[PDB]
Design a protein around this ligand. Structure first.
Ligand code: C9R
Length: 292
């Protein structure tokens, strides 16, 4: 639970501006290290139980700032930015099947560590593409895994914005198991495949209602390979007990990566977005219209 003095940080982005939970690029002066700094209202000593977690697919803890009123947590800075920004940029056109498999495996692995391998079991509860970042070598790192337990206050702002990623039982404050993260993972995989914002332009409460009451799920284009479509359907089951664990997902991904037919089918799908984008847009028009 290393303490980093506020005076040992050179901020690139003014740390005054954002709400609690905002993250700033900074330099850790005495270490000559680029870092991320998440601004917090306060942090409890108990948070030290998570300071020992370490895995190549979760963001690496560096230290804590403990000088009132300045509180924060310091981590590694992933040089390529957030997964959400990448997906929704034209840069995502570069992605082929190998890219997607590697990144899908990255997230799955990090979530398996949190669920099963860490000294303290962690259910994320807020997994989404905005909470994944891309390190300089392309390794994906999961962020905010301790938010739900140690700084839940940071999760309030655009809770509505997050509804597309939230399992029905989380939206309803029903009993929650580790598989709530499998549901969210399914949405992240859908984003990588379609490179679209889930339920784009839809009111969050409307999303939440459709997901919970009508069993609505994100549109899977008909030309999406069946192995991927099936994985998404498993992640998205209403009955949380029937969703796969991350151990099971990893095994599914390994099976898919041995399928010699898949790369051509998937790459043809990925590069065909001009063809199937209308399928997603049609569902959105329909849901918006039916709301009217
Ligand atoms: C364009 O944006 C970007 N580009 N490159 C980037 N690299 C990194 C980041 C980036 C870092 N964090 C970031 C952060 F600073 C502080 C904490 C967290 N998580 S935590 O659960 O609170 C947490 C983590 C580790 C140990 C914990 C121990 C107890 C409690 C909570 C703990 C976090 F996730 N968030 N985002 C954005 C970007």
């Amino acid at each position: 639970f290393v303490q980093i003095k506020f005076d040992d940080l050179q901020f690139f982005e003014n740390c005054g501006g954002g709400s609690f939970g905002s993250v700033y690029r900074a330099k850790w002066i005495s270490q000559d290290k680029e870092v991320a700094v998440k601004k917090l209202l306060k942090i409890e000593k108990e948070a030290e139980i998570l300071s020992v977690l370490s895995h190549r697919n979760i963001i690496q803890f560096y230290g804590v700032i403990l000088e009132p009123p300045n509180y924060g947590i310091v981590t590694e800075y992933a040089s390529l930015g957030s997964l959400y920004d990448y997906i929704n940029s034209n840069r995502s056109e570069e992605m082929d099947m190998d890219h997607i498999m590697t990144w899908a495996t990255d997230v799955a692995k990090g979530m398996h560590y949190l669920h099963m391998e860490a000294p303290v079991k962690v259910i994320h509860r807020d997994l989404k593409s905005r909470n994944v970042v891309i390190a300089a070598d392309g390794v994906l790192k999961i962020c905010d895994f301790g938010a739900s337990r140690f700084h839940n206050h940071t999760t309030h702002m655009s809770l509505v914005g997050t509804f597309p990623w939230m399992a029905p039982e989380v939206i309803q404050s029903l009993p929650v198991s580790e598989t709530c993260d499998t549901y969210s993972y399914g949405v992240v995989l859908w984003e990588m495949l379609t490179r679209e914002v889930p339920f784009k332009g839809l009111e969050g409460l409307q999303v939440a209602w459709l997901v919970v009451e009508k069993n609505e799920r994100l549109t899977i284009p008909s030309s999406c390979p069946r192995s991927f479509a099936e994985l998404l359907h498993q992640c998205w089951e209403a009955d949380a007990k029937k969703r796969p664990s991350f151990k099971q997902i990893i095994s599914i991904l390994e099976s898919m990566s041995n399928d010699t037919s898949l790369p051509d089918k998937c790459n043809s799908f990925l590069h065909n977005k001009a063809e199937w984008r209308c399928e997603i847009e049609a569902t959105l028009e329909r849901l918006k219209k039916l709301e009217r």
